[PDB]
A paper describes a structure:
Here, we describe crystal structures of AztD homologs from P. denitrificans (PdAztD) and Citrobacter koseri (CkAztD), a pathogen of the carbapenem-resistant Enterobacteriacea group. In each case, the protein adopts a beta-propeller fold composed of continuous antiparallel beta sheets forming 8, 3-, and 4-stranded blades and containing a disulfide bond between highly conserved Cys214 and Cys231 (P. denitrificans numbering).
The crystal structure of CkAztD was solved by single wavelength anomalous dispersion data collected on a crystal soaked with lead acetate. All zinc occupancies refined to > 0.7 in PdAztD and 0.4 in CkAztD. Part of this variability likely arises from crystal-packing effects, particularly in the CkAztD structure. In the structure of native CkAztD, the feature containing site 2 in chain A projects into the pore of chain B, making a hybrid site with two zinc ions and His104 apparently bridging between them. A buffer molecule introduced during crystallization is also nearby in the pore. Thus, if zinc is transferred associatively between AztD sites, this process does not compete with its dissociation to solution under these conditions, and the hybrid zinc site in the crystal structure of CkAztD is most likely an artifact of crystallization.
Numbering used by the authors:
A (entry chain A): 31 to 405
B (entry chain B): 33 to 405
Write the structure that this text describes.
């Protein structure tokens, strides 16, 4: 038969719980108790979910229960119950998580090393870690490559400031080549074979073929107004990045083209954004007015908006829970933490079709899934 | 005299259209029983329309065949036509032709079907049924008086097969099992046939005895990943496989360092080899680009945007482009726009868009050049 399966993973803002919900009909598949409130990341394969618990000093790992086999003209889908895996990563203040092609790099803001591992080992229940020295504890990022990593460089005068650039290291932590300076580095995302790190002058763009990774700097277009990016997302089916650019602007970046940057002005301040992995021409931004906004990436504009929640005006209460967006199959999911629900929209009509009740303050959300044959 | 033809299956309708590759003109439309995957014979004389949901494989005389004088070669050009021969059985799957021997797998049967290409064009339905122990999603490779067949999982055959073995044409085991967990992916290139699995490749060769299977493990220097789908060089001996969805591996079975990795810009939608200029292969990626692979250099040598993006997320059977090479052109189906894009294989410049009613999807090309008089 032919089976479609998608799952939501939803972290509570206050309680150390991750809920798993069937995205297609909203029923509860599992509740996992962890140590602290979590931020969530999925692997590219979708087979693992990582729950980063900064205040608890741990990263927990969940087997999503959905995995695929690439068989050319068809795909197979393997479906099992979601489960908490034995793999935990421990260290002071876990921060940015980056996974690509099964390679995993977990940053720890309070440690002098990042932890590199692999998804295939994790799924088998093996913990096989490489600790890579990052010189001094700082709020940084590590990007995993074949036999190398790219790591942020701590500010040499006060490591509590933002990092000052990035460098290639081998997996013994040995610097390779020259430092790529990028003052005020913060923000990271991948899109296809290109990884981006944002800073005050532009983006660092990283690729790897059959040698060490190569870092190039793309400065912000001179046609842009003053600003810089501190948070990034990356297209899935098409190569691009979207960054913030001040609190009510975003930029769209094409790393494959010379006419690289386009500015979109939002009517109110940005709460969250995500790309649509299924409909590659679209991304979504949620704004403080309570509206979900459809971004037409190729036209470089907001193509439509719809009210989903009451306003979450962020001026003055920057720390409180706010909506987060996920996409699964042909639906868009928006958490409404203050109402203990998730709003479900049809992606193409851009209208609400259902809502899912989730006790607590459902906050961070990621989705995995697809369809395949079952023989 | 030159003649090339394209056979194009609709994604949803039981239709196979035939187009003259040189001017784009529609030549024929064949109505079959269900939506078809398409395979061609090595000779190009026959096209096979595998209709999984319909329980049948139909056979089409392409209308282009070659016969010799020794060497030389004449090109015999006729209208394409449906042939009476049909293979029937539950859930036809993998088609493997090797040297005019054809092996058709049926996921729902306990036997695979072996036949000759010649015997099809001559109207003969002489099917040899080779027992494969239990129904499973496997593969059979035909040899002279033997076949190599996948081994079903002994627990439940519903899982992926666990290896391959040589059998006689009754299905009686010959020799020892070649274990290869999670076996899937099959292609031939020159004197070697490859099956991929989670530990590496099985490589099959044959002289005057049973075929011989050896295991080529993935090089320990490779990143984590595995291969589950393969294509084989035609005119140069190599294999190309996936290695996760946005990478391919190039495999040279004659080199001790057999594996070379290539990073794709985005995830792979389809790939084929170039049978005319054998040092090239082509990968279509979800970003809508066609990528030329220079196999000798081990690199992507050029890329061009051909379609809108077709993300590999969604459903596995959302309609997406497929590639075929004919003469000095490359053809890319664009199912959601009811058309085929034509590019010059050297310059990668688009020369034509051929509209085809429906959702043109799977595509294969046959043809060549010979004398007539
Ligand atoms: Zn298959
Ligand atoms: Zn399969
Ligand atoms: Zn941060
Ligand atoms: Zn002649």
């Amino acid at each position: 038969e032919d089976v479609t399966a998608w799952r939501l993973f939803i972290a509570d803002h206050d309680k150390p719980v991750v809920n798993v919900i069937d995205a297609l009909d909203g029923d509860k598949l599992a509740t996992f108790n962890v140590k602290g409130p979590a931020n969530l990341s999925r692997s590219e394969s979708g087979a693992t979910i990582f729950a980063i618990q900064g205040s608890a000093g741990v990263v927990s790992t969940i087997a999503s229960g959905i995995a695929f086999h690439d068989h050319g003209d068809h795909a197979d889908i393997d479906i099992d119950a979601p489960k908490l895996l034995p793999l935990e990563l421990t260290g002071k203040k876990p921060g940015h998580f980056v996974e690509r092609q099964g390679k995993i790099a977990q940053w720890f803001d309070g440690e002098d090393s990042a932890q590199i591992l692999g998804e295939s080992a994790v799924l088998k229940g093996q913990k096989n870690i490489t600790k890579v020295n990052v010189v001094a504890p700082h709020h940084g990022v590590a990007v995993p490559y074949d036999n190398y990593a790219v790591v942020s460089i701590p500010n040499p005068d006060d490591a509590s400031k933002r990092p000052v650039g990035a460098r290639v290291v081998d997996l013994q932590g040995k610097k390779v080549g020259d430092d790529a300076l990028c003052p005020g580095l913060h923000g990271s995302a991948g899109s296809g074979d290109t990884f981006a790190l944002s800073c005050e002058t532009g983006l660092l763009l990283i690729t790897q073929k059959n040698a060490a990774p190569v870092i190039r700097h793309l400065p912000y277009a001179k046609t842009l107004p003053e600003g810089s990016t501190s948070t990034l997302i990356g297209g899935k089916g098409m190569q691009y990045f979207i960054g913030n650019y001040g609190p009510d602007r975003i930029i769209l970046v094409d790393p494959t083209e010379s006419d690289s940057f386009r500015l979109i002005q939002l009517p109110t301040r940005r709460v969250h954004f995500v790309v649509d992995p299924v409909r590659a021409k679209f991304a979504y931004v949620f704004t403080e007015d309570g509206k979900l906004n459809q971004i037409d990436v190729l036209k470089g504009e907001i193509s439509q908006s719809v009210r989903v929640t009451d306003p979450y005006s962020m001026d003055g209460h920057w720390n409180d829970p706010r909506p987060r967006i996920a996409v699964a199959d042909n639906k868009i999911y928006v958490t409404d933490p203050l109402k203990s629900k998730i709003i479900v929209l049809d992606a193409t009509s851009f209208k609400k079709t259902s809502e899912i009740s989730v006790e607590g303050q459902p906050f961070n959300i990621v989705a995995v899934g697809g369809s395949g044959k079952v023989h």
